[PDB]
């Protein structure tokens, strides 16, 4: 039975290099090429290249030329991947794979029946940045039979995660804390909102409590209607 | 009425039983005398399909060449499977002779005669023969040496050009000589000479052919991406010695795009410790013989791989390939297929 | 060269999933399934041939350049993300996630002008909230002085609520302070099945 076993996950910094292994068993190693595919949440699966064990012939994806190296050890039947000049864009789960059809006389590379279990690699800066907390003000006029939405915008922080509570956790009903988005600047941002009766806008105080453990940051922000 | 079939072919040659040369000795015991009066029958109103990449003739030739090399080029030490085999390693006389492959009774070889035939697909001009032409079992990588030339234009051959895992065979219609020499009086150091004028003109024709297959994209050559020396360099056996030549200069994009003219000299080296192309492992041979070791060969083809990847740029990149010696045999057996009569 | 659609598919167990891939090149097309936290698995190769262990509930088809993976009678182990492939190329992926069915609920739309605290930072974020709607499928378009916006907006969606089985969506429009002070009308238009007509919430900069 064909098996591919990969080395453990790791965390790297921008500028570093990474190396990962894929041990193969259950078939004649030299008969079939081995491929490396990486998976990142949000993006297309990316074929990085293949490596034919017999004489180590390789073919690297264009956009990775010069950064990637694929070798192998015949005796231990292990394939190896190296990627240099790591950036945030290299954060992904790395797989080694081999095609379904593989005989001593012929193969087809691209129907990937066989997959390693995957090797998660995180590339990120050791720097941390505290969030900005801006009030998302309800409105101007108070209504005595309608519901009001309010919240706070938690902007430009790194890395994940931030958590948000309201009124030190006393307010939970109608609260929505949205998954963070990654901005173009490389910094994260999210929103937390809550719907409340509009008649309680001049009576109850609404504080959002933002927590960002990596930057050791705890911020309370009162969200009140703009005086005009 | 016939049909495509597979059988055990017999070999024929013009070997000499008085010759101490390795290919001759093998062929004497493995093959029969050749036919002075061959017979070829051109078939009218007949259209047959061919596929050089699924031609089982290639498999048999492979076994033969492996047997030939194993019975002859015996190492001093054989390093495979974590074990060590110490044998005797005397120097030998080595010079590949032509080998004809032939069909037994009930079978016959169909031959494609279309001048622009690319290796796969239908063939209009088909003839019937009992034996192939004389094929030299030349083992090499990157460059195809001493082979037969294409009749008309340069022919691009691939099982599937859109599949970057499939080898491309470029079949030349005008040979270019490569003159490799290990001088007398580092004994392992050698060099190859090529006429830059001839080569760069052929290479330019190669890119224009490639343009026809790749939508007039800019065609770019690059050194191999990696691998063992046997494939990152032009690997071949001359007079018994294993040569490794650095072909970086052979694929100079500047010259196919002043001064490039002249005699190109590729740096070579003779290794005594090699990786076997038979997929076996590391073999160890004695030091080279004294005196001028030289061989002049026809470059008759090129082995290439094409870069892939989620790109969008206006250019295709090609790199010298090889390693699968079965491809060497395909490049000569491409116009042949075995059929069974009833 | 490979265009997979849709991006997200929200279905209940027992229903059928229809995933399509448009190609421009020609070669054998494969389909893969990735369950959460697990390695991708080969489902279909060569267009419609079922891999080992794959139930006849999975079937591939092709009309012209469009290849389709249909999954009948969705089971728990069928949900996840699916990818089509040709040679080294892969589709964007189709996320198939569990949806619990309920009555259609239109969203309550709210818009929030940039904070005055933030406007001292040179950046201006406008937030549009879509609250408690069903089904998940919803479109949000930003308009600035009645001009459609592209490439300056980010959206985030909650997981289906465990109690009321609704979704909420947050869209953020980010402009420079200079660019923000340039225009007057800022609006987010919301189209959803629970609305008989697209609904637009807007404010005029400066006035309260
Ligand atoms: C060779 O010709 C056949 C027949 O038309 C065609 O199907 C195939 O694509 C061609 N191959 C190359 C490499 O041009
Ligand atoms: C090399 O090519 C020349 C003509 O280009 C030919 O005369 C000669 O026989 C060839 N040598 C071989 C095929 O060994
Ligand atoms: C070889 O083929 C090329 C086209 O690929 C052609 O331009 C050239 O004239 C040919 N050389 C011959 C037939 O000697
Ligand atoms: C090959 O090159 C050597 C010099 O290295 C030269 O003496 C010899 O004449 C050349 N042979 C041919 C056939 O050109
Ligand atoms: C290279 O070949 C050309 C003919 O193609 C010939 O005229 C020229 O003299 C050769 N160059 C050298 C340095 O021998
Ligand atoms: C071949 O020679 C070139 C000379 O420019 C060099 O850059 C390259 O590294 C050499 N290749 C190997 C495998 O040593
Ligand atoms: C090619 O053939 C010539 C004679 O025709 C011979 O001298 C030379 O060694 C051969 N080259 C190879 C690589 O076998
Ligand atoms: C090329 O490969 C595809 C599958 O990837 C196959 O359907 C097609 O028949 C192949 N073409 C040739 C000419 O072999």
Short mmCIF file of N, CA, C and O in Angstrom, two decimals, chain B residues 80-144:
data_model
loop_
_atom_site.label_atom_id
_atom_site.label_comp_id
_atom_site.label_asym_id
_atom_site.label_seq_id
_atom_site.Cartn_x
_atom_site.Cartn_y
_atom_site.Cartn_z
N UNK B 80 25.16 -0.84 -4.91
CA UNK B 80 23.69 -0.82 -5.00
C UNK B 80 23.04 -1.59 -3.86
O UNK B 80 23.48 -2.69 -3.50
N UNK B 81 21.98 -1.02 -3.29
CA UNK B 81 21.23 -1.69 -2.25
C UNK B 81 22.03 -1.88 -0.97
O UNK B 81 21.89 -2.89 -0.29
N UNK B 82 22.87 -0.90 -0.65
CA UNK B 82 23.66 -0.93 0.56
C UNK B 82 24.68 -2.05 0.59
O UNK B 82 25.24 -2.37 1.64
N UNK B 83 24.92 -2.65 -0.58
CA UNK B 83 25.87 -3.74 -0.70
C UNK B 83 27.02 -3.36 -1.64
O UNK B 83 26.91 -2.42 -2.43
N UNK B 84 28.12 -4.10 -1.54
CA UNK B 84 29.32 -3.81 -2.31
C UNK B 84 29.80 -5.04 -3.09
O UNK B 84 30.02 -6.10 -2.51
N UNK B 85 29.95 -4.89 -4.40
CA UNK B 85 30.43 -5.98 -5.24
C UNK B 85 31.75 -5.62 -5.94
O UNK B 85 31.78 -4.75 -6.80
N UNK B 86 32.82 -6.31 -5.55
CA UNK B 86 34.13 -6.06 -6.13
C UNK B 86 34.44 -7.04 -7.27
O UNK B 86 34.61 -8.24 -7.05
N UNK B 87 34.50 -6.51 -8.49
CA UNK B 87 34.80 -7.32 -9.68
C UNK B 87 36.10 -6.87 -10.34
O UNK B 87 36.75 -5.93 -9.89
N UNK B 88 36.47 -7.55 -11.42
CA UNK B 88 37.60 -7.12 -12.23
C UNK B 88 37.12 -6.10 -13.26
O UNK B 88 36.03 -6.24 -13.82
N UNK B 89 37.94 -5.08 -13.50
CA UNK B 89 37.54 -3.98 -14.38
C UNK B 89 38.60 -3.65 -15.43
O UNK B 89 39.23 -2.60 -15.38
N UNK B 90 38.79 -4.56 -16.40
CA UNK B 90 39.79 -4.30 -17.44
C UNK B 90 39.27 -3.30 -18.47
O UNK B 90 38.06 -3.20 -18.67
N UNK B 91 40.18 -2.57 -19.10
CA UNK B 91 39.79 -1.64 -20.15
C UNK B 91 39.29 -2.39 -21.38
O UNK B 91 39.74 -3.51 -21.66
N UNK B 92 38.36 -1.79 -22.10
CA UNK B 92 37.75 -2.46 -23.24
C UNK B 92 37.73 -1.59 -24.50
O UNK B 92 37.94 -0.38 -24.44
N UNK B 93 37.50 -2.23 -25.64
CA UNK B 93 37.31 -1.52 -26.89
C UNK B 93 35.82 -1.26 -27.09
O UNK B 93 35.03 -2.20 -27.18
N UNK B 94 35.44 0.02 -27.17
CA UNK B 94 34.02 0.41 -27.14
C UNK B 94 33.67 1.35 -28.29
O UNK B 94 34.19 2.47 -28.37
N UNK B 95 32.78 0.90 -29.17
CA UNK B 95 32.35 1.65 -30.35
C UNK B 95 31.06 1.04 -30.89
O UNK B 95 31.09 0.00 -31.55
N UNK B 96 29.91 1.67 -30.60
CA UNK B 96 28.58 1.14 -30.97
C UNK B 96 28.41 0.85 -32.46
O UNK B 96 28.73 1.69 -33.31
N UNK B 97 27.92 -0.35 -32.78
CA UNK B 97 27.62 -0.71 -34.16
C UNK B 97 26.11 -0.70 -34.42
O UNK B 97 25.32 -0.77 -33.48
N UNK B 98 25.71 -0.59 -35.70
CA UNK B 98 24.27 -0.57 -36.00
C UNK B 98 23.58 -1.90 -35.72
O UNK B 98 24.11 -2.97 -36.01
N UNK B 99 22.38 -1.82 -35.17
CA UNK B 99 21.59 -3.00 -34.85
C UNK B 99 20.23 -2.93 -35.57
O UNK B 99 19.50 -1.95 -35.42
N UNK B 100 19.91 -3.96 -36.35
CA UNK B 100 18.58 -4.05 -36.96
C UNK B 100 17.67 -4.94 -36.11
O UNK B 100 18.08 -6.02 -35.69
N UNK B 101 16.44 -4.50 -35.87
CA UNK B 101 15.46 -5.35 -35.19
C UNK B 101 14.42 -5.87 -36.18
O UNK B 101 13.95 -5.13 -37.04
N UNK B 102 14.09 -7.15 -36.05
CA UNK B 102 13.29 -7.83 -37.06
C UNK B 102 12.18 -8.69 -36.47
O UNK B 102 12.25 -9.12 -35.32
N UNK B 103 11.15 -8.94 -37.27
CA UNK B 103 9.99 -9.71 -36.84
C UNK B 103 10.07 -11.16 -37.31
O UNK B 103 10.52 -11.42 -38.43
N UNK B 104 9.62 -12.09 -36.46
CA UNK B 104 9.55 -13.52 -36.81
C UNK B 104 8.42 -13.80 -37.80
O UNK B 104 7.74 -12.88 -38.24
N UNK B 105 8.23 -15.08 -38.13
CA UNK B 105 7.17 -15.48 -39.04
C UNK B 105 5.80 -15.17 -38.44
O UNK B 105 5.59 -15.32 -37.24
N UNK B 106 4.87 -14.74 -39.29
CA UNK B 106 3.54 -14.38 -38.84
C UNK B 106 3.43 -12.91 -38.51
O UNK B 106 2.34 -12.35 -38.48
N UNK B 107 4.58 -12.28 -38.25
CA UNK B 107 4.63 -10.87 -37.91
C UNK B 107 5.38 -10.09 -38.97
O UNK B 107 6.13 -10.66 -39.77
N UNK B 108 5.19 -8.77 -38.98
CA UNK B 108 5.90 -7.92 -39.92
C UNK B 108 5.92 -6.48 -39.39
O UNK B 108 5.06 -6.10 -38.59
N UNK B 109 6.91 -5.71 -39.81
CA UNK B 109 7.04 -4.33 -39.35
C UNK B 109 6.46 -3.36 -40.38
O UNK B 109 6.84 -3.38 -41.55
N UNK B 110 5.53 -2.51 -39.93
CA UNK B 110 5.03 -1.45 -40.78
C UNK B 110 5.86 -0.20 -40.56
O UNK B 110 6.19 0.15 -39.43
N UNK B 111 6.22 0.47 -41.66
CA UNK B 111 7.10 1.63 -41.60
C UNK B 111 6.42 2.87 -42.17
O UNK B 111 5.89 2.84 -43.28
N UNK B 112 6.45 3.96 -41.40
CA UNK B 112 5.86 5.21 -41.86
C UNK B 112 6.86 6.03 -42.67
O UNK B 112 8.01 6.21 -42.25
N UNK B 113 6.42 6.52 -43.82
CA UNK B 113 7.31 7.23 -44.74
C UNK B 113 6.91 8.68 -44.97
O UNK B 113 7.46 9.35 -45.85
N UNK B 114 5.97 9.18 -44.18
CA UNK B 114 5.58 10.58 -44.24
C UNK B 114 6.73 11.46 -43.76
O UNK B 114 7.25 11.27 -42.66
N UNK B 115 7.13 12.41 -44.59
CA UNK B 115 8.34 13.19 -44.36
C UNK B 115 8.22 14.14 -43.18
O UNK B 115 9.23 14.55 -42.60
N UNK B 116 7.00 14.51 -42.83
CA UNK B 116 6.78 15.42 -41.72
C UNK B 116 6.19 14.72 -40.50
O UNK B 116 5.61 15.36 -39.63
N UNK B 117 6.34 13.40 -40.44
CA UNK B 117 5.70 12.61 -39.39
C UNK B 117 6.27 12.94 -38.02
O UNK B 117 7.48 12.91 -37.82
N UNK B 118 5.39 13.24 -37.07
CA UNK B 118 5.87 13.74 -35.79
C UNK B 118 5.97 12.68 -34.69
O UNK B 118 6.37 12.98 -33.57
N UNK B 119 5.59 11.45 -35.01
CA UNK B 119 5.68 10.37 -34.03
C UNK B 119 4.36 9.75 -33.64
O UNK B 119 4.30 8.55 -33.35
N UNK B 120 3.30 10.56 -33.60
CA UNK B 120 1.95 10.07 -33.30
C UNK B 120 0.97 10.44 -34.40
O UNK B 120 1.17 11.42 -35.12
N UNK B 121 -0.09 9.67 -34.54
CA UNK B 121 -1.14 9.98 -35.49
C UNK B 121 -1.09 9.10 -36.72
O UNK B 121 -0.31 8.16 -36.78
N UNK B 122 -1.93 9.42 -37.71
CA UNK B 122 -2.03 8.62 -38.94
C UNK B 122 -0.86 8.83 -39.90
O UNK B 122 -0.25 9.90 -39.92
N UNK B 123 -0.56 7.81 -40.69
CA UNK B 123 0.48 7.90 -41.70
C UNK B 123 -0.07 7.44 -43.04
O UNK B 123 -0.65 6.36 -43.15
N UNK B 124 0.10 8.29 -44.05
CA UNK B 124 -0.43 8.02 -45.38
C UNK B 124 0.47 7.05 -46.19
O UNK B 124 -0.04 6.11 -46.79
N UNK B 125 1.78 7.29 -46.18
CA UNK B 125 2.73 6.48 -46.94
C UNK B 125 3.34 5.36 -46.07
O UNK B 125 4.28 5.59 -45.30
N UNK B 126 2.76 4.17 -46.17
CA UNK B 126 3.18 3.06 -45.34
C UNK B 126 3.79 1.95 -46.18
O UNK B 126 3.24 1.56 -47.21
N UNK B 127 4.95 1.45 -45.75
CA UNK B 127 5.56 0.30 -46.40
C UNK B 127 5.73 -0.86 -45.43
O UNK B 127 5.71 -0.68 -44.21
N UNK B 128 5.90 -2.06 -45.97
CA UNK B 128 6.06 -3.27 -45.17
C UNK B 128 7.49 -3.81 -45.23
O UNK B 128 7.98 -4.16 -46.30
N UNK B 129 8.14 -3.90 -44.07
CA UNK B 129 9.50 -4.43 -44.00
C UNK B 129 9.63 -5.53 -42.95
O UNK B 129 8.81 -5.62 -42.04
N UNK B 130 10.67 -6.35 -43.07
CA UNK B 130 10.92 -7.38 -42.07
C UNK B 130 11.85 -6.88 -40.97
O UNK B 130 11.77 -7.32 -39.82
N UNK B 131 12.73 -5.94 -41.31
CA UNK B 131 13.70 -5.41 -40.35
C UNK B 131 13.71 -3.89 -40.34
O UNK B 131 13.39 -3.25 -41.34
N UNK B 132 14.09 -3.30 -39.21
CA UNK B 132 14.32 -1.86 -39.14
C UNK B 132 15.64 -1.50 -39.83
O UNK B 132 16.37 -2.37 -40.28
N UNK B 133 15.94 -0.20 -39.89
CA UNK B 133 17.25 0.25 -40.37
C UNK B 133 18.28 0.00 -39.28
O UNK B 133 17.94 -0.41 -38.17
N UNK B 134 19.55 0.24 -39.59
CA UNK B 134 20.62 0.04 -38.62
C UNK B 134 20.62 1.10 -37.54
O UNK B 134 20.83 2.28 -37.81
N UNK B 135 20.38 0.69 -36.30
CA UNK B 135 20.30 1.63 -35.19
C UNK B 135 21.44 1.44 -34.19
O UNK B 135 21.63 0.35 -33.66
N UNK B 136 22.19 2.51 -33.95
CA UNK B 136 23.30 2.46 -33.01
C UNK B 136 22.83 2.71 -31.59
O UNK B 136 22.23 3.74 -31.29
N UNK B 137 23.10 1.75 -30.69
CA UNK B 137 22.66 1.85 -29.30
C UNK B 137 23.40 2.92 -28.50
O UNK B 137 23.96 2.63 -27.45
N UNK B 138 23.40 4.16 -29.00
CA UNK B 138 24.19 5.21 -28.36
C UNK B 138 23.50 5.73 -27.12
O UNK B 138 22.43 6.35 -27.21
N UNK B 139 24.11 5.48 -25.97
CA UNK B 139 23.58 5.97 -24.69
C UNK B 139 24.11 7.37 -24.38
O UNK B 139 25.32 7.56 -24.25
N UNK B 140 23.20 8.34 -24.27
CA UNK B 140 23.58 9.71 -23.94
C UNK B 140 22.41 10.51 -23.37
O UNK B 140 21.26 10.11 -23.48
N UNK B 141 22.74 11.66 -22.77
CA UNK B 141 21.74 12.59 -22.26
C UNK B 141 21.95 13.97 -22.87
O UNK B 141 23.04 14.27 -23.37
N UNK B 142 20.91 14.79 -22.82
CA UNK B 142 20.85 16.13 -23.42
C UNK B 142 20.89 16.11 -24.95
O UNK B 142 19.99 16.62 -25.60
N UNK B 143 21.94 15.52 -25.51
CA UNK B 143 22.11 15.48 -26.96
C UNK B 143 21.97 14.06 -27.50
O UNK B 143 22.46 13.11 -26.90
N UNK B 144 21.29 13.93 -28.63
CA UNK B 144 21.22 12.64 -29.30
C UNK B 144 22.36 12.57 -30.31
O UNK B 144 22.47 13.44 -31.17
#
